[PDB]
Amino acid sequence: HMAPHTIPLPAAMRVQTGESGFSLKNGVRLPEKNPLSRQAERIFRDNGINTALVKNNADIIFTEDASLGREGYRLAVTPDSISIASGSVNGTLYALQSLVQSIAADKNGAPALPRMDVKDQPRFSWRGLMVDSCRHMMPVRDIKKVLDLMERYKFNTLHWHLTDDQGWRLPIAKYPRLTTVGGARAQSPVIGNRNKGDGIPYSGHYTADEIRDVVRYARDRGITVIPEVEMPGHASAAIAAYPELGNTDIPGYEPRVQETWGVHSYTFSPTEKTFRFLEDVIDEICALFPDSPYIHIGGDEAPKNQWKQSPTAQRVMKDNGLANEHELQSYFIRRVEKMINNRGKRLIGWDEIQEGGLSPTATMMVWRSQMPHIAAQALAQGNDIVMTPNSHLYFDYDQGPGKPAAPEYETINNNQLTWQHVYGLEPVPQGTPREREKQVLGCQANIWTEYIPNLPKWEYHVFPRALALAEVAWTPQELKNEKDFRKRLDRQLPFLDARGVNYKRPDNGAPAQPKAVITRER
Numbered sequence: 157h158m159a160p161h162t163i164p165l166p167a168a169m170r171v172q173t174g175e176s177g178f179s180l181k182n183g184v185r186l187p188e189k190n191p192l193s194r195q196a197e198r199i200f201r202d203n204g205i206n207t208a209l210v211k212n213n214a215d216i217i218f219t220e221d222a223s224l225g226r227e228g229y230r231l232a233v234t235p236d237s238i239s240i241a242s243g244s245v246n247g248t249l250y251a252l253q254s255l256v257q258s259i260a261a262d263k264n265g266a267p268a269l270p271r272m273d274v275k276d277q278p279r280f281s282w283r284g285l286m287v288d289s290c291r292h293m294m295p296v297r298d299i300k301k302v303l304d305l306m307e308r309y310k311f312n313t314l315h316w317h318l319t320d321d322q323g324w325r326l327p328i329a330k331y332p333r334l335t336t337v338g339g340a341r342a343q344s345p346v347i348g349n350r351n352k353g354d355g356i357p358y359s360g361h362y363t364a365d366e367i368r369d370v371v372r373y374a375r376d377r378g379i380t381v382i383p384e385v386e387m388p389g390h391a392s393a394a395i396a397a398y399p400e401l402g403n404t405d406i407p408g409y410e411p412r413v414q415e416t417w418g419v420h421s422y423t424f425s426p427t428e429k430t431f432r433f434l435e436d437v438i439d440e441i442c443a444l445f446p447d448s449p450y451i452h453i454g455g456d457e458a459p460k461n462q463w464k465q466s467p468t469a470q471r472v473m474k475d476n477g478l479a480n481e482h483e484l485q486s487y488f489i490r491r492v493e494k495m496i497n498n499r500g501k502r503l504i505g506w507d508e509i510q511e512g513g514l515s516p517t518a519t520m521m522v523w524r525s526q527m528p529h530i531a532a533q534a535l536a537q538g539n540d541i542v543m544t545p546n547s548h549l550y551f552d553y554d555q556g557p558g559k560p561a562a563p564e565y566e567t568i569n570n571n572q573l574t575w576q577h578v579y580g581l582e583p584v585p586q587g588t589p590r591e592r593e594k595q596v597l598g599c600q601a602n603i604w605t606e607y608i609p610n611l612p613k614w615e616y617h618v619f620p621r622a623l624a625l626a627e628v629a630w631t632p633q634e635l636k637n638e639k640d641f642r643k644r645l646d647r648q649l650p651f652l653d654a655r656g657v658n659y660k661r662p663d664n665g666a667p668a669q670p671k672a673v674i675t676r677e678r
């Protein structure tokens with residue numbers, strides 16, 4: 157039998173390629189009473205293997221071992237049975253995904269599994285992708301395709317970037333204008349000519365039932381959805397909907413849902429009214445994401461100028477003994493953190509949240525790789541971090557050669573972040589004390605959508621880079637090997653082809669689906 161092509165590479169795997177394996181030519185019999193068989197049914201059928209729910213003498217034996225924890229598993233494949241041990245449902249999902257990526261043709265060309273044993277568990281507990289639904293919005297049906305592929309590669313976290321300057325997508329019943337006004341912009345930058353507007357309104361939001369459906373579908377695939385509501389910056393859509401939430405006393409105050417990309421100046425005012433609005437929003441977020449351990453508050457790229465120009469903000473600073481607008485930002489984050497903690501969740505924010513003082517309880521999402529001291533200081537102060545470095549995991553960035561020259565394939569910049577570059581990432585900062593390595597929760601790629609209007613382009617930007625990230629996030633650093641990874645990656649392509657995924661071809665860099673239509677039309 158050929159060697160398994162599983163990505164991420166398991167931590168321990170012994171394959172006896174010369175021994176008799178388990179033939180799949182007649183499908184797999186699943187124990188009908190075990191709820192886990194429903195997930196096995198789904199995963200085997202995704203890979204072209206027939207299944208049947210049987211009362212007696214199933215082929216798969218599910219066993220429980222609490223020592224395997226939330227995500228660890230064991231696999232034992234003999235000619236007689238396929239045994240899967242886990243400590244939780246998600247460990248079983250991961251065993252099943254490893255199993256299907258161990259399928260190879262037998263002597264007669266029928267699918268079979270080798271005689272093999274696997275014991276596996278992830279290096280990092282946070283293994284994420286971030287979807288930006290604000291710059292362009294992707295429908296639930298497309299998010300579900302993303303979630304299916306995330307489970308296959310053992311990603312466990314979808315960070316959902318739901319509010320920004322160019323659109324607010326998160327349904328809040330108490331403040332309907334956030335979506336009816338804040339969900340709509342009058343135009344977008346022209347594709348191929350970002351410095352001009354297209355004159356075409358662009359709007360959308362998720363309904364409450366759609367939010368909950370995504371959360372549930374993700375959870376059934378082992379994925380926790382973590383919501384992000386941006387503050388105090390990236391707030392133009394919310395402020396356009398409710399102008400009293402911004403710095404209304406500045407010269408030239410004219411909030412609007414923004415039509416252009418980049419950093420915008422409209423920040424929330426640090427007032428009691430704004431804090432009550434945010435508490436109301438956080439309350440509804442907790443109802444929509446009841447199982448999320450975190451609420452991401454954003455915190456990036458909030459220019460201080462409007463606060464400098466606002467007598468209201470200056471008075472808040474004097475009231476609270478704040479010497480400058482960085483301390484004002486720290487104060488803002490501290491007050492929102494209390495709202496989140498009072499609902500039993502943890503705050504996470506982009507690495508700008510250390511400005512004016514990093515809360516000792518906040519979790520930091522590290523993205524500005526050009527400022528390595530920020531992550532080092534956060535770790536030294538005892539804080540947990542998640543690594544989303546712009547040096548490696550900004551999947552809006554370009555890749556290696558081979559892409560079409562057409563404007564539809566344009567990207568934000570000409571930085572080439574290839575899958576090879578991603579594969580060489582090591583998330584733990586150099587010189588981190590051994591006892592502080594547990595504060596590095598994991599890593600995640602961010603897929604900003606200024607230049608990604610729809611799913612085929614999203615797939616080109618994300619695959620195969622996310623497969624390299626999946627291995628970085630799961631596999632021990634010392635087991636990574638680019639040459640072997642390429643072999644396994646090449647063996648993933650038939651599965652991705654059968655789903656019509658528009659990945660960037662490893663061989664020549666062209667789209668796998670060169671005729672896919674990339675459009676803003678929804």
Ligand SMILES: CC(=O)N[C@@H]1[C@@H](O)[C@H](O)[C@@H](CO)O[C@H]1O
Binds near residue numbers: 523552568604
């Ligand atoms: C935390 C973060 O990444 N902030 C912005 C982001 O809003 C934008 O979409 C991205 C495009 O690369 O550029 C970053 O500066």
